[PDB]
Nucleic acid binder design. Structure first.
Lengths: 79, 95, 140, 93, 248
DNA sequence: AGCATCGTTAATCGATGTATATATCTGACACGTGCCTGGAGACTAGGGAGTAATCCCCTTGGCGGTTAAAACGCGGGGGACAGCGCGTACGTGCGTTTAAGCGGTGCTAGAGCTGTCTACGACCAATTGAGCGGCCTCGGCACCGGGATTCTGAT
DNA sequence: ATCAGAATCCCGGTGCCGAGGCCGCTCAATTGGTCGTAGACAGCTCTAGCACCGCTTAAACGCACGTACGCGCTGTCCCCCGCGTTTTAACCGCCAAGGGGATTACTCCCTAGTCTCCAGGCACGTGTCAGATATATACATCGATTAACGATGCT
């Protein structure tokens, strides 16, 4: 499938950036779950803004308005 | 051979030094499409939109691992555990 | 493309590129990176058949093949109207424009057949067939 | 279609602060989204202050109070100073 | 269809391409003449490997993702005339330019030329200088489908460049009269297919393609005492259930 | 008291990654240009905001009597914390696959803009009844007093 | 596993101040008409998004192995809890002064609106250099083993 396409080395690198030194073996499944949650939360909003405009394309502005909608503001992609 | 924990620190400095994106494009894009299938079928995504979800997702996970690291270090342990993650998400009010 | 950082430093004279249909568009990276290749005086292109039926890229072709038309890029798109009153339209469009194309393009392309060189070609050696479906599949 | 932006203005201010330093296009986009963000914040707070006090007109006072609400500390003090100086010079001449 | 996904009798009974394919194969191996076939990529070539392994007719395989080592090695494996394998799989895009063969004979194309230059490109890999055999080409198409419409558009395009490349055929030494010769005769061909714009299940019709002489017509009668004589039929729950799972 | 040996901290050397100096090569950045639509100037009406005057009610302040609550102390038991040891789980490196990345082809669906044209909402005059401030009941709930019940702790 | 006993639930009784219904009295909600205009709908263009394969190679995956650390266990000690006693400041009830919120009447001048005119800024090009990359060379740092110095013991 797909969510498994996020790789143990990937999450490992994301933890190396955050400052984590050593990682337990069970962090990976939980990280995939959290990522799936957050992605569902943002994508449902972006698809909502998309359906309201009566468009079949999900643009960058829809995602920006979904992130700003949930309280996390994003710059550089428009706004 | 290096003593265990040195390569990890060198990786910390390396990845904290650059701006590189840490998740490969195509798997993340297929994941976004799969998650979007459950809402409305036959949707079109612009490249900048997928890039936006990658920026927000990666930054969110980086912050989550920062706070999780704070929890693990507060427990007098250098190894983060799932209870540290779900603890941070419990204190932030996300659950 | 990867070794263009090396093999393009040295000077070249006569290059041989094969399957011009693979070349196709001039917007493709291969084309515009063959200008990164510096220069080779003599050139050539080998192909088993010319470009796509639509033929907007006759431009691209004769630009990479020849000094001729590289000055004016946007010219021939309306002069391509021959392909796209069959007697009169074939006459003006097909006969006029295509007679012009032959008049200009004679001393470049070279084509022959197998029957010309031999006649040992056994037949036209081309047929087709038809088939049926299955209802369990046909419902799809 | 002409889509306006703040790009040239951020460019001018950049040439005032650092005449020798240029800016990438992506950083210019970040600056644009920043100016639009802060603009919508101050305008929104001004709308709230105008609605709570029952007034239909946004003046420099509501924008001032909005700046004092949004910008912490020295950003608010120096911001109100620069803005008040700008309105001063504006209406004076 | 099946949970077990083992090699099954019904793998080749689901469509007609495998039925007529199982019809021609005994005559293929019978006549001793080989065949080239072109395919789409990924699962199509895999399933064809599963069929040719099912009835056990040995085959080479070639495609885009293979290395150059066994590319040239397989090319050399073809060149041995003692070959006991007749057919084999080759990719239209990857391998259409991939070989030069004087010794081949028969060609088959499933994809029906999304570009005609690819089908005529890989099409001439049979007939070659010094061909001691007689070539026959087959386009396998099913009725009541979009693919024969793709063939329609295909020779529509063959006319489109038929005013270009079939105009470019008489140009070599810059002749004079032959151009209008191909305009009147070829124009009778495009008019013939203006008529074209707007079965074979029995043994004889299929015998006609690969016969090429009465000698082959006679030696193929040995395959008529089983395929026809034979001392089930082609064809619900999979249709309703299929409609349920495919409704996503 | 001196010398020798042992213990352990005192010492240098190598291999890897990391910084520096020069060359080179390109794709994004800086600047000039034609044009056009939005910004500035000028003029007018009117309604919202400023401003004076008055009214009153809710804030502040004080005082005195009650008393629940906070401060202060004092035993002591249980939990914070350090130490120690075990076992196993994760870092680390290497050989082997494998899809990611880049390119290139073919198609076309829907983003994006325009041109009408019309139903629909802003706006004003007329009208009136739903909701609200002031004003009355009266009863559900706070408070209390007693008894029965339950949960905690030392035998 | 059990009674003594302190805290809590349960039940009956009592008094009260806020919930709930009524009644004028508006003034904003409803109706009836206009009038301009935002967007609904049809049409046209053409760009970027979709699928797929060819081909290379940096990354992922599986595995062998070592040892760093998580966790369980134990001992110690210290410090925060449970309770008694004593003090004090919260609380409540009342009374009084007054000033700042709330409203109304009057007026004026700042901005919405429209018309007119033009240049500040924008898409489109053009050239061109900051730095990203590559090669060469040297420094920082970790990991290893040494090999010296000091102390203790023996003669």
């Amino acid at each position: 499938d797909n969510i498994q396409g996020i790789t143990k080395p990937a999450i490992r690198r994301l933890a190396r950036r955050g400052g984590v030194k050593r990682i337990s073996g069970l962090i990976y499944e939980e990280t995939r779950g959290v990522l799936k949650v957050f992605l569902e939360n943002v994508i449902r909003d972006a698809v909502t803004y998309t359906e309201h405009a009566k468009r079949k394309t999900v643009t960058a502005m829809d995602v920006v308005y979904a992130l700003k909608r949930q309280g996390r503001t994003l710059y550089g992609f428009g706004g | 051979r290096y003593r265990p924990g040195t390569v990890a620190l060198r990786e910390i400095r390396r990845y904290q030094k650059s701006t590189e994106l840490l998740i490969r494009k195509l798997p993340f894009q297929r994941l976004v499409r799969e998650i979007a299938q459950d809402f409305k079928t036959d949707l079109r995504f612009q490249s900048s939109a997928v890039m936006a979800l990658q920026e927000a997702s990666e930054a969110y996970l980086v912050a989550l691992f920062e706070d999780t690291n704070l929890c693990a270090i507060h427990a007098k342990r250098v190894t983060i555990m799932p209870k540290d993650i779900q603890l941070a998400r419990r204190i932030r009010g996300e659950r | 493309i990867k070794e263009r950082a090396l093999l393009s430093k040295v000077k070249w004279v006569h290059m041989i590129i094969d399957e011009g249909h693979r070349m196709k568009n001039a917007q493709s990276k291969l084309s515009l990176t063959l200008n990164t290749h510096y220069h080779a005086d003599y050139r050539l292109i080998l192909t088993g058949t010319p470009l796509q039926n639509n033929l907007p890229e006759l431009w691209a072709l004769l630009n990479f093949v020849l000094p001729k038309i590289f000055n004016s890029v946007k010219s021939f798109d309306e002069w391509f109207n021959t392909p796209f009153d069959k007697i009169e339209l074939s006459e003006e469009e097909t006969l006029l424009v295509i007679r012009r194309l032959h008049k200009v393009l004679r001393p470049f392309l070279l084509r022959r057949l197998k029957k010309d060189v031999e006649k040992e070609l056994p037949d036209k050696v081309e047929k087709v067939v038809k088939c049926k479906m299955s209802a369990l599949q046909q419902i799809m | 279609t002409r889509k306006e932006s703040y790009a040239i203005y951020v460019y001018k201010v950049l040439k005032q602060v650092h005449p020798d330093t240029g800016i990438s296009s992506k950083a210019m986009s970040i600056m644009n989204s920043f100016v639009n963000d802060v603009f919508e914040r101050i305008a929104g707070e001004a709308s709230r202050l105008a609605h709570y006090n029952k007034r239909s007109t946004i003046t420099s006072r509501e924008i001032q109070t909005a700046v004092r609400l949004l910008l912490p500390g020295e950003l608010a003090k120096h911001a109100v100073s620069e803005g008040t100086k700008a309105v001063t010079k504006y209406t004076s001449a | 269809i099946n949970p077990t996904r083992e090699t099954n009798d019904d793998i080749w009974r689901v469509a007609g391409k495998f039925e007529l394919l199982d019809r021609i194969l005994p005559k293929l191996k019978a006549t001793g003449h080989r065949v080239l076939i072109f395919f789409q990529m990924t699962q199509i070539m895999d399933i064809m490997e599963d069929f040719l392994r099912y009835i056990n007719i040995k085959y080479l395989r070639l495609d885009g993702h293979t290395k150059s080592d066994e590319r040239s090695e397989l090319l050399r494996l073809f060149n041995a005339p003692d070959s006991e394998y007749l057919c084999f799989i080759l990719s239209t895009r990857a391998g259409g330019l991939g070989l030069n063969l004087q010794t081949a004979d028969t060609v088959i194309i499933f994809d029906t030329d999304w570009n005609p230059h690819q089908d005529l490109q890989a099409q001439d890999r049979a007939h070659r200088i010094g061909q001691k055999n007689e070539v026959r080409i087959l386009r396998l198409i099913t009725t009541n489908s979009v693919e024969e419409v793709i063939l329609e558009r295909a020779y529509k395009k063959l006319d489109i460049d038929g005013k270009v490349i079939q105009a470019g055929k008489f140009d070599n030494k810059s002749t004079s009269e032959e151009q209008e010769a191909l305009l009147r005769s070829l124009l009778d061909a495009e008019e013939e297919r203006r008529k074209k714009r707007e079965e074979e299940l029995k043994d004889s019709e299929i015998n006609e393609i690969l016969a090429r002489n009465d000698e082959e017509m006679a030696v193929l009668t040995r395959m008529d005492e089983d395929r026809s004589k034979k001392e089930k039929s082609r064809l619900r729950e999979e249709s309703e259930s299929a409609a349920v799972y495919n409704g996503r």
